[PDB]
Amino acid sequence: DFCLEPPYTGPCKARIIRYFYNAKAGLCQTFVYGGCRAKRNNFKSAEDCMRTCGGA
């Protein structure tokens, strides 16, 4: 799953911030994206982030 899982920023993440849903916070917080790591749990828009991960 890619809704309640934490970001995989690791030791690689340039100057391109994105969004991820923090199941403990209640919304999709802004975090950067990397070209060296890059995984599935990553959303560019908060709308598609909460809609694809959550829904309500």
Curated annotation (Swiss-Prot):
Part of the intact protein present: 38 to 93 of 100
Transmembrane segments: none
Site (Reactive bond for trypsin): K13, A14
Disulfide-linked positions: C3-C53, C12-C36, C28-C49
Function in brief: Inhibits trypsin, kallikrein, chymotrypsin, and plasmin.
Domain BPTI/Kunitz inhibitor: 3-53
Protein name in the entry: Pancreatic trypsin inhibitor
Superkingdom to which the source organism belongs: Eukaryota
Gene Ontology biological process terms, A to Z: negative regulation of platelet aggregation; negative regulation of serine-type endopeptidase activity; negative regulation of thrombin-activated receptor signaling pathway; trypsinogen activation
Chief site of localization: secreted
Any one cellular-component term (Gene Ontology): serine protease inhibitor complex
GO molecular function: calcium ion binding; molecular function inhibitor activity; potassium channel inhibitor activity; protease binding; serine-type endopeptidase inhibitor activity; sulfate binding; zymogen binding
Keyword field: Disulfide bond, Pharmaceutical, Protease inhibitor, Secreted, Serine protease inhibitor, Signal
Localization terms from the record: Secreted
